[PDB]
C-alpha cells in the first residue's frame, strides 16, 4: 500500500562515515519493513545520478544488505533540486514497479547544502505535491548547525514540516513513518 523512495546525497560534502551511516539507516528502514506491503527504491545523487535499484528490482530481490552494500559514493557538487525532479518522474513511474494508487513517500537524506543545481526547490516541490508524494527529510552531519541549511529543510519537507524532518543518528523518522503507515 506504500511506495517509499530514497534519495541519498552522495556529493563531496557527505563525509565517508556519514555516508556509511546513511547506508545502514536506509538498510534498517527496508529491513524493518520487509514482510509488509511496502516497496522500496533508491537514487543516489551528486552532480550525476545513479538509481541503485528500482521498485521492480527490489520486488525481484528483497534483500536490503545485497542491494545497499555495493553502493559507492559519487562525490562532486550537490544537485538536490534536480534529484527531486528525477525521483518523481523516474522512480515513481509505473514502468519501474511503482504502483499508481499507493502511498508515495520520498525520503531525502542530505546535509541541506544544495550547490550548483540549475533548479530551485520552488520549481520542483509543486511537481512532487501534484503526485501526492509525502516528503521526509533526514538531516546529516552539520545540517542542523547553520541557519541556511535548517531553513532549506523546511522548503523541501512536506506541508507539516514538524512531522517530516529528522536526523540520521536515530530512527525517530522510521517510527513516524511506521505510525503514519499504521494509521493508513
Amino acid at each position: 500500500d506504500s511506495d517509499i523512495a530514497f534519495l541519498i546525497d552522495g556529493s563531496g560534502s557527505i563525509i565517508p562515515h556519514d555516508f556509511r551511516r546513511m547506508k545502514e539507516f536506509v538498510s534498517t528502514v527496508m529491513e524493518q519493513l520487509k514482510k509488509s506491503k511496502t516497496l522500496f527504491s533508491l537514487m543516489q545523487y551528486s552532480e550525476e545520478f545513479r538509481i541503485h535499484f528500482t521498485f521492480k528490482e527490489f520486488q525481484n530481490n528483497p534483500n536490503p544488505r545485497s542491494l545497499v552494500k555495493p553502493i559507492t559514493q559519487l562525490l562532486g557538487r550537490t544537485h538536490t533540486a534536480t534529484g527531486i525532479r528525477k525521483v518523481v518522474r523516474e522512480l515513481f513511474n509505473i514502468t519501474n514497479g511503482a504502483r499508481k494508487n499507493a502511498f508515495k513517500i520520498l525520503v531525502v537524506i542530505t546535509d541541506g547544502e544544495k550547490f550548483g543545481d540549475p533548479l530551485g526547490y520552488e520549481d520542483v516541490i509543486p511537481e512532487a505535491d501534484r503526485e501526492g508524494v509525502i516528503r521526509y527529510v533526514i538531516g546529516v552531519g552539520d545540517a542542523f548547525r547553520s541557519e541556511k541549511s535548517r531553513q532549506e529543510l523546511n522548503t523541501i519537507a512536506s506541508k507539516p514540516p514538524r512531522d517530516h524532518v529528522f536526523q540520521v543518528n536515530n530512527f525517530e523518522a522510521l517510527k513516524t513513518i511506521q505510525n503514519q503507515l499504521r494509521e493508513k
Epitope: 542542523f144 548547525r145 535548517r150 529543510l153 524532518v165 529528522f166 536526523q167 543518528n169 536515530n170 525517530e172
Partner: nanobody, 122 residues
Framework: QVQLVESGGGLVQAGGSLRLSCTTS????????IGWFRQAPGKEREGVSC???????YYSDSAKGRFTISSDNAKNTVYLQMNNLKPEDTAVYYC????????????????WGQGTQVTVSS
C-alpha cells in the same frame, strides 16, 4: 507544570551586551535541547541559538561570533550571552525546548516560554 521563564531582558545601548536566562522547571532538563527564538512585531520570526547535550551548539547567521549560549545543568537554566547588540536585534526573545532525541537542535520546539522584551537603542 512545565515552565520556561525568560529573564535578563531590558533596554541597552547599541554596542552593549545582555545575558538572558531561561530558568526551566516541570520537565526532566536533560531530555531536552533548549534554544532561543525572537520575533519583533511586524517582522518575521528567527531562530537564534540552541544547545543540546548530544548534538552540541547551534547559532543563526546573525548570532554566530557575537552570541554565546551556555547551560547550567545543575540548576536547569540556559543562558544566552549576547555581545555587540544592535537596534535590529530589538525583539521579544523566547526560550523554548525540543525533545533532544529527535536530534534536530531546536528546529520544532515542543514548549515555549512567554517571552521577554529586549530593547536596543542608540
Amino acid at each position: 507544570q512545565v515552565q520556561l521563564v525568560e529573564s535578563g531582558g531590558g533596554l541597552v545601548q547599541a554596542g552593549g551586551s545582555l545575558r538572558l536566562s531561561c530558568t526551566t522547571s516541570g520537565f526532566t532538563f536533560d531530555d531536552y535541547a533548549i534554544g532561543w527564538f525572537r520575533q519583533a512585531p511586524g517582522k518575521e520570526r528567527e531562530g537564534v541559538s540552541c544547545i543540546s547535550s548530544s548534538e552540541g551548539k547551534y547559532y543563526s547567521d546573525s548570532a554566530k561570533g557575537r552570541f554565546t549560549i551556555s547551560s547550567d545543568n545543575a540548576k536547569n537554566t540556559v543562558y544566552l550571552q549576547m555581545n555587540n547588540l544592535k537596534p535590529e536585534d530589538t525583539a521579544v526573545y523566547y526560550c523554548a525546548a525540543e525533545w533532544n532525541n529527535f536530534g534536530r537542535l531546536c528546529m520544532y520546539p515542543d514548549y515555549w516560554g512567554q517571552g521577554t522584551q529586549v530593547t536596543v537603542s542608540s
